Design a binder for this molecule. Structure first.
Ligand code: NAG
Ligand code: NAG
Ligand code: NAG
Ligand code: CL
Length: 290
């Protein structure tokens, strides 16, 4: 078992093939089949062809971040049934992941897809990832959150979606995420949230929605959040008239930690906080009650 190229090969704590920041233009040939950790980060790999690591049956960790990934083959990860961590982040020119790329990775615990320029989450992309706990999708180019996108992710605790261009939250965007603990949707273009979009998020404790385009929010959308303890809503154009009364009422009973809910309109209440207003301030109009 010769160590490929200028890689560093060692056995403890796990059999590791480390070849970082060597300017590699492709996955090196001859990676030992006993590899449990493969570090190919910081190079210049542009493609990941099919069965690139099929001999590493015991592969549990694979890092490909900070490369030049422009295309990943659909069968790139064939035979990696024991893969627990996959890192593809900091490849801002990836743009699109084939929807079959992650199939069969039933032991995957964490998946780093942040800063990959992702344009869309095609159907079936996260199918079958029943073990996944951490999913990093922030700092991409996402323009929609299709329904059932995380339907099989019953063990997901952390979903990072901030830093995209998501325009709204449909009803089934977060179906199945029963174990979800942290959900980060800030720094997007979220303008509306379906009243039942957070139906399965009864175990959620942190919800970040600041820096969006929310002008109102029906109190129904927060009602399923029985476990919530941190809520961010600042940097949104809140309308503080009759339409904000339900959100106002829910916030009066919230025992957790919440950010400012700054009023954008009317100018009389400019940058006042909704939770600190009186009910008499929320009368008249400036749909719904109007
Ligand atoms: C994976 O590990 C098992 C037991 O640790 C070993 O028998 C097997 O040969 C390994 N697979 C390789 C080296 O491809
Ligand atoms: C999901 O989590 C539960 C409890 O943490 C665990 O028993 C189960 O095996 C996990 N799912 C998978 C596919 O490992
Ligand atoms: C917010 O939504 C309004 C429509 O209600 C639209 O005119 C405006 O351009 C949006 N702003 C951003 C930053 O998305
Ligand atoms: Cl590690």
């Amino acid at each position: 078992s010769p160590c490929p190229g200028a890689c560093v090969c060692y056995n403890e704590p796990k059999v590791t093939t480390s070849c970082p920041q060597q300017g590699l233009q492709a996955v090196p040939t001859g990676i030992p089949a006993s590899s449990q950790r493969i570090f190919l980060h910081g190079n210049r790999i542009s493609h990941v062809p099919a069965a690139s690591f099929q001999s590493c049956r015991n592969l549990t960790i694979l890092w490909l971040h900070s490369n030049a990934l422009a295309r990943i083959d659909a069968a790139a990860f064939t035979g990696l049934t024991l893969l627990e961590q996959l890192d593809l982040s900091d490849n801002a020119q990836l743009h699109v992941v084939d929807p079959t790329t992650f199939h069969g990775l039933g032991h995957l615990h964490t998946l780093h897809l942040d800063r990959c320029g992702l344009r869309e989450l095609g159907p079936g992309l996260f199918r079958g990832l029943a073990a996944l706990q951490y999913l990093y999708l922030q700092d991409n180019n996402l323009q929609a959150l299709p329904d059932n996108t995380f339907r099989d992710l019953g063990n997901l605790t952390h979903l990072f979606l901030h830093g995209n261009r998501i325009p709204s939250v449909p009803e089934h965007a977060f179906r199945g995420l029963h174990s979800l603990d942290r959900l980060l949707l800030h720094q997007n273009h979220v303008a509306r949230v379906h009243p039942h979009a957070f139906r399965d998020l009864g175990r959620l404790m942190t919800l970040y929605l600041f820096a969006n385009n929310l002008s109102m929010l029906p109190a129904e959308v927060l009602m399923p959040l029985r476990s919530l303890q941190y809520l961010r809503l600042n940097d949104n154009p809140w309308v503080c008239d009759c339409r904000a009364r339900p959100l106002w009422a829910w916030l009066q009973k919230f025992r957790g930690s919440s950010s400012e809910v700054p009023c954008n309109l009317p100018q009389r209440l400019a940058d006042r906080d909704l939770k600190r207003l009186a009910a008499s301030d929320l009368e008249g109009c400036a749909p719904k009650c109007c």
